[PDB]
Structures are given as C-alpha cells and as structure tokens.
Design a binder for these strands. Structure first.
Lengths: 507, 510, 23, 140
DNA sequence: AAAACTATGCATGCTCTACTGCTTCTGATCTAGTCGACC
DNA sequence: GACTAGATCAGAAGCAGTAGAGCATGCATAGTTTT
C-alpha cells in the first residue's frame, strides 16, 4: 500500500434534502455537513497528507473545469486544514441553509453522468500517487431519473467506466419520507451490493454513525526500522526486517513563530571563541574528561571510534530454554523480526524452519544485536511467535520472532534487605474475595492517553475558534464509587483482621 | 562507604628470580596492584589507598626503636588514588637485595592505619600482604598482634605465588593459616588467594553502580483501603555518569568556548528576531495555529500527583510480555519498619499468586509526570516477596501491521530433511545443560553476569591516553571478546550441523 | 475487508476505549 | 475581540492585559479622535486600569464627575444582574420614603400608595370563603 | 549537649537538538513512435 | 526533420526513530548555628 487516499464528498442540493420530517431532527443537509466536518477533523489528526474534496450537485450555479451546468465544485482535492472546515461551517444550521441557498442555489435539475465526469476529472488533476480513490454520495432520492431512461443509461455507463478505472463508489443514503430503495436504480452504480443491503431502509445508513465517530490517534503505515542480516555462521546469512509493533506516541513538536505576523522563524546554533569572537568550525575543538585529578583529551573521531565493536546485524549465539528467560528482566520495548526475500533469496524457508522447530522445542534464539554503525552490542533473545487469528479470521498475532533485550550486569540494582512477614490463611482468603469482586477483562486498546487527547482537543478548539474546548473523559481514573459499592463490608473486615485498632495509615 | 586499604608489599631478592618458564612473582604482584589501583581510580568510591614496602635498603617508619622495625619504608600515605600513584608504581617501585619479616610489615601497616585513621570516617580497614614467605618468621609477638587486630576490627588478606615448594614456604603457609584461623577461623582459609586467581578477577573494570531512591506512596484499592509502599527501580539502561566536555584545541579550556542561538525570519533581508518575540505554535493540517506556553499551561491536563491506584484485577494470561512499554521496572515493597503494611502487602501478593491474577494500576511519579497505566504482578522468593510493576501500552501506541502467514505458504514450505537439519542445529547449539541428578537446568552462557563492554572500552581508552599521551588508541581486549562470545564447546559441536544446513538451504544474495 | 475503516483505508476500525467494565 | 471565544477567555485568565469591545474602533474612526475607554466598551480590565477607573467611575458604569443621559442610564440599568432580597413591605416603605423625600407625589400614579383600601367583596366581613367575584367592584 | 535551619550532591523526569535509515518526488537521459509535406 | 511520450536511474527532501545533552524538583545527608 503506497500513495495517498483521495476522497470526494458529493452532496445533493435538491429540495427534498432541506426538509425536516420532525421538528426536533436534523435535515439531510445538516447531517451530511456534520459528517464531512467529522471526517475532516479525523483526517487532520490521523493522516494529514491525504486529499479531500467537496462537490455539490443539483445547484443553480456552476463551477468546474468542464463548465458543466448545475455542478458546483466547492473544494478541489487538497490536504485538509482549518480554513476548509470553517468554510463548511457556514451551512451548519437553518441560517447556514439560507446562506447556502443564497450563495449557490438549489432545486435545479442535474445529470449523474456529468457529476461522475467532474469527479473523475478532479481525480485526474492530482499529481501525487493515490493508493485509493473513493466517492461518497449523500442523497435521499432513490430514483433520481425516473422520467428519463436515457439519463439512467448514461449514468450506468459512466459508473461502469469509473469502476473500471479503479474508483470506489459508496452510497450513504439519508432518511426519506417514503423510504429508500436501493433496488430501484443504485444497484448498478454502487461498487459493491451486499446481500443484506437489499431491503428498503427507513432510516439513515449505519455508515453515518461510523463517520461521526471521531478518530484522534495517528495511523502510521507499515515501515521497517531496519533491514539486517542474521548470521548463523560466517557463511550462512539470511535477511530480516525489524519492525516496532509498540511505539510511544508523542505530542507533535512545537514550532517557533514570529509574533507580529505569525510567520515561522528558523534557528541556528554556532560556537565562537570568547577572545577573537569568530566562528569555530567543529574541526577546531576537542573533547575532555577529568579522572584522577588529570585532564584527558580525545578528538571527536576517536570519541566515536570508542563505540565501534561489530558490523550492523544479528549474530547467532545459541539456543536457550524459555524458562531461563524472566519477565521482571524487562529493559526496553520489544521488536518484531520477519523474513525479507528482497535482499537474500531463500531466507523465508530457513526462517520458517527455525520458527517451527523453536516452537516445537520451546527454545529462544540468543543473539548479539548491533542496529546501526558505531553502537555497542546488546544481547537479544528471539522468542518464536505463532500466528493467532480471532473469530472473524482477522489476524491478531502475526508469525515471526519477538526480539527481547536482555540486561547486562550494570543494568540491575541492589535492593535494601527487608525481613519477610507472611500472612495467615484468613487474611489471604479475605483478600482473595476482594480481588475476585473487582475482576475485569483487559485489552491492550482499553485505555487512551489523557494528555494527548486533551492536547488534540485544545488544538482543535483553538484552530476552529470554538466556544470552549471539549473535555476528555479519563478512563485511567479509578471508579471509586463502584468499587466501594461492590466490595461492601469486605474492606472493613480486612482492615479489622490485618490492621491494629490504632494504626492510622494516612498519618 | 569509605574504606582504607594498606597494601604491604616486599621487594626482597627472593622474588627477583624465578623459573624462566613463568613470570616472576614480583611482576605478578606489580600487575595485581596496578589493576587494583586502576579500578579504584575509575570507580570514584572515595576509598583511600596507602602503600608500604618491606625489604628495601631505605628505612622510613613512624616507629624506629632499635634493630626492630627496620628496612621498611612507608612509600605512600593514605590519600585518594590518582595517576601519580600509578606512575610511582610504574617506575619508583624497584627490587632490592635485603630480606625482612612480614610480621614487622604487619606491625608497621597497623601502626600507619591507627595513626592516619583518626579524623576520617573510614568504616572498613583491609591490609593485603604480598610475600613469598621465603624469609624466616620472628614469631614472638603473635598474641598482641591478634589482640590489637580484634580490638581495631581490621581485616587481613594474603596473596601468594602458589595456591612443589620448599619447607620454609610450607612453614610460612602454616603460620599464615594459624593467623587466619585465629582471626576468623574456618572461613579464613578462603581469604588466602594466589596471584593467578587474583589476576583472573581484577581484569575487569568496576561496573557502574548507582543507588536507587526510595519512592514512597500508598497503594489504594477503592477509597478506604490503603497500603503504605516503597518503590525502587530494579532494571534500567545504565549510562555513563560523566559526559564529554568540549574544549578549545589550543588553550585546552572550556572557559574559552560557549554556544549562541540566533533566530531569523523567512526573508532575503534575513532580519534578526529576539527571544522575547518568539511564540510557540503547532501545525494543524495545512496551517499553523498559535498556542502560547502560558495558555498551554492553563489548558494543560492537570492531575493529582503521586498516585498508585488499582484500576482492577485481570488474569495473567491477558497481559502479554510483548506489550510491555517504558524504560524501567519497579519493585514495590511494604514501607520500611511497618508490620501492618507488610502483612497487607503479603496478603495481596499471595492472593494474586494463588488466583493467577495481576493488578492493572495507575502510576504517576509526581505532579509534573504524565500518568501511566501499568501491571503489577507478584514475585515470591524463598526469602523475600514483593510486587513488580511494568508499564503497559495505550491505544495510540499500538501499531496494527498485517503480515503474511508462512505456515500455509506453498512457496516457502520446508521439507522433512530441512527440518531435521534445523533440529540437529538447535540440539547442537544448546546453551543450557540438564543435570539429571537434580533434574535442574544450568545456564552455560549467563548474559546477566556480563559487564557492559562499552564502559570497559571507554575506561581502557581513557587510561591508555592518560599514561601514553601521544599514541593511537589500542584495540579491543581479547578477554572482552571472549566474554561476549560463547564457550568453545558450543562452537565446536555446531560445525557439522551448520555445514549440513548450508548444503540443504540454497541462499542467493541479490 | 470486513471491519475496515471508512476514514483510513487499509486499517481496521479500532473499537472505542471502554475502560474498566466489571463483570 | 468582539466574540467571547477561547482566545478571549485565555486572555482574561491572565490579568496582564485588557480587552475592548470592537465598538471602540468604530467610535474612534467615526470621530477620527482618540476617544478614551469607558466601562460600556471594556469587557475586562487589568488591575491598574481597574484602579484608574475606580477613581472616576463607580462599580457600575455610571460615572461620578459627568452628568448622565437617558441612553447612559439605560446602559447602567442593563449592567448589573438582579436584586430580589427584599419583601413587599420593605419595598413599599422604601418607595414611600423616596417619594416623600424627593417630592414625586404629584405624579399621576403611586398616589394611592400611602392608603390601604378594603372592599365589601365578601358576603360576610372577614370571610375569605364567600368571594363575590363577578361584579363591577372587582374591576374597580 | 541537643535541636533547627541551610548547603551541596545526586537521582529523577521531561524537553529539546544532531545523526542514520526508509520512502517518495523531481530532474535528466535514452528509446520508440507520430505527423507534415515533398517526391 | 521535428517533436512528443513512456520508461528508467540517480539525487535530494521529508519523515521516523534513537541518542545525547540540558533544565527544573526534591530530598539525603551533613554541617553549622542557636539555646
């Protein structure tokens, strides 16, 4: 998967889209605009290099390259930004609806062939490489051309051509007074007609709920940290790729702005001798260290040469039972090792054999790891990792090796000696009851970073000029009230059974 | 912490000669002392070393009297080690033609310790005797020596050229054993080392050692239960405590160097902008939104500090090792001198161990530290029991990559012969031995007992530069490579399997 | 294909964070 | 800043500057003069500007040293929030005191205030259960 | 002689600035083909 | 002849990730002064 995702938002501007069936409900136009804004914000946070565009059809004005009638291209394909969201924000209500009607117009005829032609033309203009091409059609008219059969055939031909070119078409049908029947016309236009998506729908599509679900986490495409050589011997070498399935998420780095016009300023660091005042190149300086009441001077090149031990790669050392590995010897986040046939042919077979036999024999491959040049070696254990899939056949545990860093003698620390006081069985049983009361199922994706979420909320509020920032719910905070309710009198009994009457833990 | 070591050596002619096929004992003693002094210099423990020699024509002792306490020189009094001492041992220490009794050497060493010890808080005192025991022993004051040593709480160690000796050497060994038995008894027999054994141990620089700060808090389950706990850091990636200082290539001083930062605009004129007019900002898609630091602090996420709370309890199977994050592992004990807290924590640990469960908890070092979600699991040993805490990932830190399956890949399906070759390789390169008598696994290559080679290299280079100012840096020592490589048996056994694997697996570089 | 993201193609729709849900 | 967005609130949360309603620029441009600030325009003051205003201005927009006009009094009467800490009797006594002191009794209304009036709207005197509603006496 | 206040060293976290490796965009070059018009 | 279009290689810029240095917080410990 290489390229950028391109998305075009087609929104109908017919009269039927501007009527509210119930007093307390959203018109189709308002729902469409809300969805567009939500997708824009999600894209800004997640993938900022993707291309989005917004088009309207059924209007009185026209703005397009082909000079077609009744098609207004509001925003051509470009990366998302705050200005575009603000531009869309002036159609978000009833006054916004009046503003939209005044600016463009509504209630005019149209041809779907021309609309799809304009969308394809927009796709053609893009000069980058697009991995996906998608159009979403927001409408509530199941039979756009019931009077004219020729227009329907033209639309079918254009949809077929677009599908051939590699453009996905999706229908996001909104609520209709009489109900939406995809069976009438939109079966041929739609890219994929699901078996369940054939009955008449009396409510908006289930895709709107997913669109309105804001995603506020960066999505990074697959990428290999390094391509290394695993050396079983001086002659047997295979090529492997190293990946990181867990990486800490950090706030985007701040940029320095000039206050009077908000234009970026570039910074530069230079070193100049106190006496002469002139600049000193890096070649006109040395390095020093004090030890034993003396000064030891070394050049920079030697300072870097001190770190050179062996060439980049993994060197096999032997095989170790998995029992000898320890869970409390964690040192650094683990990595993933997978085969790579691009550099050496036949690596996949040997890697598969090693994985299978390591799983059968319950062993881990001990190795010496040197990621880059001028990096002292570390010791790693490659633990086999079988393939595990969930119910829906979506792979959840990939096959390969897990690279775990092992500590050196210097990385451990000495603990103060503490006398052991064991607990009588009754205390252990009471605490077992307490533990059992508060049992729950844990998943790796059950928590969110409060700091990053608040940062993104604040940034969005500042950018879009909202009244107040949205406040994120912190799921890491304990639920004290629920725990107190569940435990009941267990806490009091345990405290009576384990703490003297006059202890005062707080003091 | 502090420790004063009085190294008492000899320069008698009896060591000036030895069998040509082995190094002379005097050279062995010199090498041992050099290695010890190097370790002390590059391990800043504030210990002190004094050097005394007996068997030299010179006579310089605090106590002279008559013929007794003669032919002994206190070469170096008690001060912190420095390169000047290494230079002194390099050249100043010279052999001699006279003899002397090591008993008098012990007397003078004890006298020096007693005289110079006052005024400093040296809690330990060790005296090391390097003698070949060739000279006769004037055993006439043993009782007073033992009484003084026991009164002053001073430890004594011996270093000999042997672990085929003359009767005089046997008598010396006997008297030394008697003295050690009197001082300590049976265990003393392990305090007499040989030169080869000492050279074995003193070939590695002292490991970087730091002291963990005790972090107190209260482990909470709900709003009414709290256990006073202290946490320490058990495993972390060690770094050099000293960093390089940039100096000017001519005057060799850091005072003639300093850095400056210059800000300029995005214009041809290259306008200069001061630090008092630079605001902070971020990029929101295709634009830049100002966000000052003051407003960032106002709108920041604020949390109550020093939290160790129990979100819940989950089966150990649901927490997997591959998801551990962070850069540290914490060990949580009950608060010092608190029996009630000890009982509470023991109850929790035993309950979790019995039920096969771990505690998902929230951790915050202080007010300025970001909150964390981690796992605390029990650790029970035969002497101590505690909790071990390791951080766990957030939603944003997980990466969902898809990889093809190798089990069902027709292209890369191994054959039976290939699998047999790999099995033979795995069995030949085993790094653990299964003793059947105890049915126990022994680790042939323990990685956790290997000092970091980086610090060995750094200290070797620094020492070589200090003692040889104008000379290129040396290569990596052989023993470092030996201790980073597996035992020779594993390599020897694995050649035939490796040849078979090379034969069966076609690998073509592209 | 099933359970794919309608915003970022090629990625699976992550389930919303649920925190602690006691049994 | 004419809109109370997040940036205005942030500037408020720091007492290091002051905010002005956009009408100040309109007044300055129309008159082409540097008309000073007045409480009507400002939406927040620094401590120092607060001290400056407190000398020539009360806690409410009404000033000390300059007469007032109907529009200004309307702004003042739109400034504070509310006051409902009295009771009918207390309010009536206050009103009577004000009228007596400042001689406003000649006004067409409020001239029955000093008088309490009873009516024979009940079949029996001092009987609330015999209301005689449905007569000209009610409208009287 | 005992207790309270202060100095200095060291651990700890977070933030910011260089260096290496992977991916994508642009420029430059070569090779193959098309078109105008003549004969 | 003239010109255009498709494919390919090389270099460079952008981005991600690790390492190293610097800055602020607090306390351990000891020393010094006061009563």
């Amino acid at each position: 998967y290489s390229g950028r995702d391109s998305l075009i938002f087609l929104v109908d501007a017919s009269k039927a889209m501007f009527e509210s069936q119930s007093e307390d409900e959203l018109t189709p136009f308002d729902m469409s605009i809300q969805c567009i804004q939500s997708v824009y914000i999600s894209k800004i946070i997640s993938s900022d290099r993707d291309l989005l565009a917004v088009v309207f059809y059924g209007t009185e004005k026209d703005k397009n390259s082909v000079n077609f009638k009744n098609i207004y291209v509001l925003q051509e394909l470009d990366n998302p930004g705050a200005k575009r969201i603000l531009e869309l924000d002036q159609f978000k209500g009833q006054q916004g609806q009046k503003r939209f009607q005044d600016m463009m117009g509504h209630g005019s005829d149209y041809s779907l062939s021309e609309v799809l032609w304009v969308c394809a033309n927009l796709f053609s203009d893009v000069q980058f490489k697009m991995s996906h091409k998608r159009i979403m059609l927001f409408t509530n008219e199941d039979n756009p051309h019931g009077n004219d059969s020729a227009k329907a055939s033209r639309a079918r031909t254009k949809a077929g051509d677009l599908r051939d070119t590699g453009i996905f078409l999706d229908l996001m049908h909104l609520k209709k007074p009489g109900g939406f029947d995809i069976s009438l016309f939109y079966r041929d236009i739609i890219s994929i007609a699901e078996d369940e998506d054939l009955r008449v729908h009396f409510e908006e599509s289930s895709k709107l709920e997913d669109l309105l679900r804001k995603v506020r986490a960066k999505e990074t495409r697959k990428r290999a940290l390094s391509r290394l050589k695993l050396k079983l011997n001086k002659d047997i070498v295979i090529s492997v790729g190293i990946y990181n399935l867990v990486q800490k998420a950090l706030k985007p780095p701040p940029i320095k702005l000039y206050r009077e016009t908000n234009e970026p300023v570039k910074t530069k660091t230079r070193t100049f001798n106190t006496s002469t005042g002139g600049l000193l190149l890096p070649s006109d300086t040395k390095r020093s260290q004090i030890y034993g009441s003396r000064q030891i001077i070394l050049e920079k090149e030697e300072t870097e040469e001190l770190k050179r031990f062996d060439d980049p790669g993994l060197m096999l050392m032997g095989f170790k039972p998995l029992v000898l590995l320890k869970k409390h010897h964690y040192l650094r986040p683990s990595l993933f090792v997978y085969p790579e046939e691009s550099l050496v042919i036949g690596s996949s077979t040997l890697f598969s054999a090693l994985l299978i036999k390591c799983l059968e024999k319950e062993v881990a491959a001990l190795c010496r790891y040197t990621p880059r040049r001028n990096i002292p070696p570390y010791f790693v254990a490659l633990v086999p990792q079988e393939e595990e899939l969930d119910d829906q056949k979506i792979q959840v545990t990939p096959p390969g090796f897990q690279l775990v860093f092992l500590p050196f003698a210097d990385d451990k620390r000495k603990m103060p000696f503490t006398e052991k006081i064991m607990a009588t069985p009754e205390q252990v049983g009471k605490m077992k009851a307490i533990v059992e009361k508060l049992r729950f199922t844990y998943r790796s994706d059950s928590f969110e970073n409060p700091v990053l979420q608040q940062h993104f909320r604040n940034l969005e509020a500042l950018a879009l000029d909202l009244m107040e920032p949205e406040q994120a719910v912190d799921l890491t905070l304990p639920k004290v009230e629920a725990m107190n309710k569940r435990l009941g009198s267990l806490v009091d009994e345990f405290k009576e059974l384990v703490y003297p009457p006059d202890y005062n833990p707080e003091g | 912490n502090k420790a004063a070591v009085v190294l008492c050596m000899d320069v008698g002619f009896t060591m000036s000669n030895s069998i040509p096929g082995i190094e002379s004992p005097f050279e062995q003693a010199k090498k041992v002392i050099t290695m010890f002094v190097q370790r002390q210099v590059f391990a800043e423990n504030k210990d002190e070393i004094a050097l005394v020699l007996f068997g030299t024509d010179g006579t310089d002792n605090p106590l002279s009297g008559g013929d007794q306490y003669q032919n002994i020189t206190v070469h170096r009094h008690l001060m912190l080690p420095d390169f000047d001492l290494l230079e002194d041992i390099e050249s100043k220490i010279q052999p001699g033609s006279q003899q002397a009794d090591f008993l008098d050497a012990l007397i003078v060493s004890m006298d020096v310790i007693q005289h110079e010890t006052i005024g400093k808080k040296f809690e330990k005192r060790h005296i090391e005797i390097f003698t070949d025991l060739s000279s006769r022993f004037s055993k006439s004051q043993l009782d007073i020596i033992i009484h003084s040593l026991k009164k002053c709480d001073i430890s004594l160690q011996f270093f000999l050229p042997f672990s085929g000796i003359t009767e005089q050497q046997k008598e010396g060994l006997e008297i030394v054993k008697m003295v050690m038995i009197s001082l300590e008894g049976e265990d003393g027999l392990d305090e007499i080392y040989s030169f080869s054994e000492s050279l074995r141990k003193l070939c590695v620089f002292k490991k970087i050692e730091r002291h963990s700060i005790h972090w107190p808090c209260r482990l909470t389950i709900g709003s009414n239960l709290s256990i006073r706990i202290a946490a320490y850091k058990s495993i972390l990636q060690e770094r050099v405590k000293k960093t390089w200082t940039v100096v000017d290539a001519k005057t060799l001083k850091k005072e003639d160097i300093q850095k400056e930062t210059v800000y300029c605009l995005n214009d041809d004129d290259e306008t200069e902008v001061l630090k008092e007019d630079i605001i902070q900002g971020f990029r929101y898609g295709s634009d830049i939104v100002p966000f000052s630091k003051v407003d960032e602090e106002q709108m920041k996420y604020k949390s109550e500090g020093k939290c160790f709370s129990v979100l819940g309890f989950c089966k150990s199977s649901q927490v997997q090792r591959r998801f551990f994050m962070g850069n540290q592992v914490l060990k949580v004990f009950a608060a010092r001198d608190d029996e009630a807290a000890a009982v509470a924590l023991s109850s929790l640990i035993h309950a979790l161990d019995d039920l096969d469960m771990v505690a998902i908890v929230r951790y915050a070092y202080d007010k300025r530290a970001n909150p964390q979600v981690g796992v605390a699991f029990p650790h029970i040993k035969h002497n101590y029991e505690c909790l071990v805490y390791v951080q766990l990932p957030f939603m944003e830190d997980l990466r969902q990559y898809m990889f093809s399956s190798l089990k069902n890949s027709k292209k890369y399906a191994p054959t039976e012969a290939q699998l047999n070759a790999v099995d033979a390789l795995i069995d030949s390169m085993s790094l653990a031995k299964k003793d059947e008598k105890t049915d126990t696994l022994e680790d042939l290559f323990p990685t956790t007992k290997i000092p970091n080679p980086r610090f060995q290299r750094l200290f070797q280079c620094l020492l070589h530069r200090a003692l040889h100012p104008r000379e290129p840096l040396p290569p990596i020592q052989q023993h470092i490579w030996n201790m980073l490589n597996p035992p020779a048996e594993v390599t020897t056994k694995s050649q035939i399997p490796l040849s078979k694997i090379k034969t069966l697996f076609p690998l073509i570089e592209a | 294909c099933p359970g794919e993201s309608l915003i970022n193609p090629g990625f699976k729709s992550k389930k919303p964070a649920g925190g602690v849900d006691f049994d | 800043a004419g809109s109370e967005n997040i940036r205005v609130k942030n500037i408020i949360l720091s007492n290091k500057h002051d905010v002005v309603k956009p009408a100040w620029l309109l007044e300055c441009f129309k008159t082409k003069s540097f008309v000073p600030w007045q409480p009507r325009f400002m939406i927040h003051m620094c401590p120092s500007t607060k001290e400056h205003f407190a000398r020539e201005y009360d806690c409410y927009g009404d000033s000390y040293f300059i007469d007032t006009d109907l529009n200004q009094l309307k702004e003042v009467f739109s400034g504070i929030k509310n006051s409902n800490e009295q009771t009918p009797e207390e309010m009536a006594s206050l009103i009577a005191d004000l009228e007596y002191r400042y001689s406003w009794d000649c006004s067409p209304l409020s001239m029955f205030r000093r008088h309490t009036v009873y009516l024979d709207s009940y079949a029996v005197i001092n009987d609330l259960s015999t209301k005689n509603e449905g007569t000209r006496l009610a409208i009287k």
